[PDB]
Write a protein that binds this ligand. Structure first.
Ligand code: 2GY
Ligand code: ZN
Length: 211
C-alpha cells in the first residue's frame, strides 16, 4: 500500500548505473561552492528503488494523456531533484500544491540533469542555512538525499526565465529554462503537475571534502 524502499547492491549494474550518472554530472558552479558545498565527489552510501503501486499507476495514466496530446511521444526523461521534502515525496508523490511563484522560480517542481545542481537545493533555496545540526551548507558529516526521477516532459516550451509561470503554456506539458547571458547557466526542467514525475531512485550520500 504505502511505499516500499528496495536496497540495490553495489554489485548490481543498476546501482552502478545510477551512481555513475550522479558522480559524473558534478559540475562547477559560479557561487564558489556557497550553496551546495565545496566538493569534487560524493560518497554514495545508499541507493534505494522506490516502489509504490498507486504512484506508478497515476504516473502511467498521466503519461498516456500527455502522449495523446504530444503525438504519441510522452518524452520521458531521467532527471535529478533535490529538496528538503524528499521523504514526503517518496511516500505521497510529487505535489505541485507545494510549488509557489516566488524569487527566481515559478509555481512548478524543478529538476536537473546535473546532480550537483540538485545538491544546491537539498537544504533549501541557495542551500538555505545548511544542514540542521551544524547549519553548514558544506557539511561533510550529515547525510543528504536526492532523487533520480522518471520525468514526463511531453511537449516542452522553451524559454529563458521561468519565474512567473503558474502552469505549462497551452498545448504544452512542461517548461525548460535555457541558458542565457545574465541568465541561467544550466537548463532547468519544470513540470506543474506532480504526477509527471516518479521518484524512481532515492540516493543517500554525502559530499566529500577535496583531497
Ligand atoms: C525552487 C523550487 C521551485 O524547486 C523545486 O523543485 N521545488 C519543489 C521541491 C519540493 C516541493 C514539493 C513537491 N512535492 C511534495 N510532495 C512536497 C511536500 N512538502 C511538505 C509536505 C508534503 N509534501 C513538496 C515543491 C517545489 C521548489 C523548492 C522549494 C523549497 C526548497 C527547495 C526547492
Ligand atoms: Zn551537518
Amino acid at each position: 500500500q504505502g511505499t516500499i524502499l528496495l536496497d540495490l547492491a553495489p554489485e548490481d549494474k543498476e546501482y552502478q548505473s545510477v551512481e555513475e550518472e550522479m558522480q559524473s554530472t558534478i559540475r562547477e558552479h559560479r557561487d564558489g561552492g556557497n550553496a551546495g558545498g565545496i566538493f569534487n565527489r560524493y560518497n554514495v552510501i545508499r541507493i534505494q528503488k522506490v516502489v509504490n503501486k498507486k504512484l506508478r499507476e497515476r504516473f502511467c495514466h498521466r503519461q498516456k494523456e500527455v502522449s495523446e496530446e504530444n503525438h504519441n511521444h510522452h518524452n520521458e526523461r531521467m532527471l535529478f531533484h533535490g529538496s528538503p521534502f524528499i521523504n514526503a515525496i517518496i511516500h505521497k508523490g510529487f505535489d505541485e500544491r507545494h510549488a509557489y511563484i516566488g524569487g527566481m522560480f515559478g509555481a512548478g517542481i524543478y529538476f536537473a540533469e546535473n546532480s550537483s545542481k540538485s545538491n544546491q537545493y537539498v537544504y533549501g533555496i541557495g542551500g538555505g542555512t545548511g544542514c540542521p545540526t551544524h547549519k553548514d551548507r558544506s557539511c561533510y558529516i550529515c547525510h543528504r538525499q536526492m532523487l533520480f526521477c522518471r520525468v514526463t516532459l511531453g511537449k516542452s516550451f522553451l524559454q529563458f526565465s521561468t519565474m512567473k509561470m503558474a502552469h505549462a503554456p497551452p498545448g504544452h506539458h512542461s517548461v525548460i529554462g535555457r541558458p542565457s547571458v545574465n541568465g541561467l547557466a544550466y537548463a532547468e526542467y519544470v513540470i506543474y503537475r506532480g504526477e509527471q514525475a516518479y521518484p524512481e531512485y532515492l540516493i543517500t550520500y554525502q559530499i566529500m571534502k577535496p583531497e
